Amino acid sequence: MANLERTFIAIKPDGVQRGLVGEIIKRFEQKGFRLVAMKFLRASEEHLKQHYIDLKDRPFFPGLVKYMNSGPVVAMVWEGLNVVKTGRVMLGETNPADSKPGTIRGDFCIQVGRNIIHGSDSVKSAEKEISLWFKPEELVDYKSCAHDWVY
Amino acid sequence: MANLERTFIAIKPDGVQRGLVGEIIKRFEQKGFRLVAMKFLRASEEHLKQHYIDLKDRPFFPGLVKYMNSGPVVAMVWEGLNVVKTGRVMLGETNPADSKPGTIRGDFCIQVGRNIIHGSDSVKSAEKEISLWFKPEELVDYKSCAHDWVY
Amino acid sequence: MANLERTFIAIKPDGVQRGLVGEIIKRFEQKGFRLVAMKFLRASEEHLKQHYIDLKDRPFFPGLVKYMNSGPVVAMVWEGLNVVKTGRVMLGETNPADSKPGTIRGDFCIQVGRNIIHGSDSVKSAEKEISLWFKPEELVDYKSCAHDWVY
Amino acid sequence: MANLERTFIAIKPDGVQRGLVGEIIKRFEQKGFRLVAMKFLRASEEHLKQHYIDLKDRPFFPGLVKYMNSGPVVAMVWEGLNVVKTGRVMLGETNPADSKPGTIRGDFCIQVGRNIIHGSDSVKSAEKEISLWFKPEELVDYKSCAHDWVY
Amino acid sequence: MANLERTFIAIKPDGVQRGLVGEIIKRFEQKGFRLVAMKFLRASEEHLKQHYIDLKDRPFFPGLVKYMNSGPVVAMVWEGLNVVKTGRVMLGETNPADSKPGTIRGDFCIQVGRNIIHGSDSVKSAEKEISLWFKPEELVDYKSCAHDWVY
Amino acid sequence: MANLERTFIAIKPDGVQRGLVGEIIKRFEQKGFRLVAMKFLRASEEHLKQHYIDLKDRPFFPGLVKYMNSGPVVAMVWEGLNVVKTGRVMLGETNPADSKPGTIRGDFCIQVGRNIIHGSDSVKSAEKEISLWFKPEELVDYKSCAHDWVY
């Protein structure tokens, strides 16, 4: 048929620390998705509270914010037909315990607390996050040489 | 138981173009299936119409034929206990959208139009396709050194 | 939561012969599990009968014993939150025919007879097997440098 | 020783387009180097002329600038003992024809024109480039959990 | 330058038997070389003697022929700037003993008797071999979607 | 031749900690070498002093002993034509700074202090170490199914 899309994928502190950046990026590349934007940064607690506003009234919130600020993250935007839905499928269940082998979480992590990566839950959330994490001039627009072979 | 089998596996133009030949063959090798035959060729529209006879009364047919002729493909025959059934599972759903991560399609493609590969839907179709794509002197008969460790 | 765990993973003769030792170990490593103990040995028929006591009445038993003694195996102990349950999920169904792509059996084997690997079915079994296969001074205790990033 | 170091690694338009970002990053990670900074951008011709000042009189200069602006690049900073020297070794010869198998260039490219990646030629150049490509607040400082095992 | 090229690459019986087809093809794909033609067949002793005419008066010849006929091989043609020269470098020394790690032979074989693969020693030999192993209508002519990113 | 051989390969504490066990083993497997014996253990300082007798009068000795006892190691014995010589080539230079990309050390480590692995320098040393680290009954003798394809 219906239309392509866009999604926000972020590699959490543990994913970076355990050296899974290349593996994660590689997987998206080999799938046929395109890297619109990518930056490495240590998200401030302020920025993170904004990212987790819908969970500010959840027990874990404080820990989650302290957590995501403990180390640098890799924030990215991937484009493609249904990126949000399939992207999350590639990520696996948010709880590594339910993530099936073959998926990023299912292959690389164990606990929900340390689930190495984040994927937007919907197109509505995707655009929100993308705006919160990226500046419009950061989203690079180019055309993949194999685009016509993926679509 | 009950008996082995044999199936027709074809790597479509997009699979070849995006450089997934080695990956796809490799996957079948590591599983324990044996390469009976393999050839690289640009299937003529005529040959393709024959391959897709059961879909000659379907809207997409004309495009499908034009499609499969746009570039060379890698036609192969793989032998093994239940190759047809398991081979397809290894391929993933025909619609990349439903292909689960870990499968060829699930890991390498996005759209059904460009689903990089083809596997026989049944033993009956397998034998038909094998005959349509290969000459009897092209199916090599040998024995894998690890055969007794697989079976 | 609730508590960690510990499980017994054994790479069968066919798994060793087909050179899948590195792949199998690698997989457990990348998941975040820790190698507590590992040894390479040709399990005697006596030792194997003990391992398969619960099946000493079934027709396959004598073959299974002769089988597992036909070549060396790699016996290991892996520690982690829910190792027994997730470990088996990583292994796939005991019957390679039902093992999903992405899993060890699903990627590397075909027949149940030659299913390349064994994982404990439960914590109760795990501890039994661990005792049967390893000596208490063989289970090494150390701390993975990325432990706090997995947990 | 004697002291660590810091180097500027940039994945050129062709390296991105051919989907080698993950492979390249992965290699540096597995080596024990640490990602200090990373950003995805389409370097402007102006910015590129500055990057290639020492070559602004050579026959190729204009082409080189037009080239590097044709698609987005991945700019990074890697830290580690002798990153500049070893990093380039990992990259291979600047001319893919002389790059040995096992290296990034030796494994992934053919022509010098399209040599997929750039590595600083010296610590002096490294700091220059790092300043030209990154803002001081972009270089993230954290400690790898396996630092004491690499050092 | 000066001009491209084309070369004859053949995966010997041992390479096929040990399951290195996917790995070897994959390596050529990731380099940017294009598969012009590929077939799976058991080279007849007669055909092989022709291939080894320049060694028909050498001690090993008799065995070499018996050898190459013992199992099926994978004959292929790869196009690219300097394929013959670089292709051989990718293969490693003909004597696995001197093949450096990172090369096909260096990573996968030990003895010269079983050196898993063959590459043309020169453009002149290449064309000879291509003609001896392939029929002109078997060399497929297409254009890789990433061609302009490789050259 | 002239004759086969055998060698002692030990994965050091850092190699284990950084999760490179599967990678290292995998590499020896894919080469065609056979695993004769393997055990996981924390080598006592006593046992280590014996292993490093020839260096007991060298400055670093005390540290080297404390070092190798800091974590568990994976001790193995690999059989094959020229294992000692080629094995070390696969390991790379003892000083990771000189280890070429493609080799274990060249791909995974940086400092000599933490060079992740050990390989015997000679057949004379190999047998010494093998005796020092393994008990005769631990060296398993079996035959690789692809032996005739490697030799």
From Swiss-Prot, chains A, B, C, D, E, F:
Changing R88A: Decreased single-stranded DNA-binding and nucleotide-binding activity. No effect on 3D-structure. This is Nucleoside diphosphate kinase B. Its cofactor is Mg(2+). Keywords: Activator, ATP-binding, Cell projection, Cytoplasm, DNA-binding, Kinase, Magnesium, Metal-binding, Nucleotide metabolism, Nucleotide-binding, Nucleus, Transcription, Transcription regulation, Transferase. GO terms for molecular function: ATP binding; DNA binding; G-quadruplex DNA binding; GDP binding; identical protein binding; metal ion binding; nucleoside diphosphate kinase activity; protein histidine kinase activity. It catalyses: a 2'-deoxyribonucleoside 5'-diphosphate + ATP = a 2'-deoxyribonucleoside 5'-triphosphate + ADP; a ribonucleoside 5'-diphosphate + ATP = a ribonucleoside 5'-triphosphate + ADP; ATP + protein L-histidine = ADP + protein N-phospho-L-histidine. HAMAP family: NDP_kinase. Major role in the synthesis of nucleoside triphosphates other than ATP. The ATP gamma phosphate is transferred to the NDP beta phosphate via a ping-pong mechanism, using a phosphorylated active-site intermediate. Negatively regulates Rho activity by interacting with AKAP13/LBC. Acts as a transcriptional activator of the MYC gene; binds DNA non-specifically. Binds to both single-stranded guanine- and cytosine-rich strands within the nuclease hypersensitive element (NHE) III(1) region of the MYC gene promoter. Does not bind to duplex NHE III(1). Hexamer of two different chains: A and B (A6, A5B, A4B2, A3B3, A2B4, AB5, B6). Interacts with CAPN8. Interacts with AKAP13. Interacts with ITGB1BP1 (via C-terminal domain region). Interacts with BCL2L10. Residues 1-66 are annotated as: Interaction with AKAP13. The keyword Ligase does not apply. The active site is at H118 (pros-phosphohistidine intermediate). It comes from Homo sapiens (Human). Coiled coil: none annotated. Its EC number is 2.7.4.6, 2.7.13.3. Belongs to the NDK family. InterPro entries: NDK-like_dom, NDK-like_dom_sf, Nucleoside_diP_kinase, Nucleoside_diP_kinase_AS. ATP binds at K12, F60, R88, T94, R105, N115. One of its GO terms (biological process) is negative regulation of apoptotic process. One of its GO terms (cellular component) is cytoplasm. NCBIfam families: PRK00668.1 (NF001908). The lineage of its organism: Eukaryota, Metazoa, Chordata, Craniata, Vertebrata. It comes from the Eukaryota. SUPFAM superfamilies: Nucleoside diphosphate kinase, NDK.
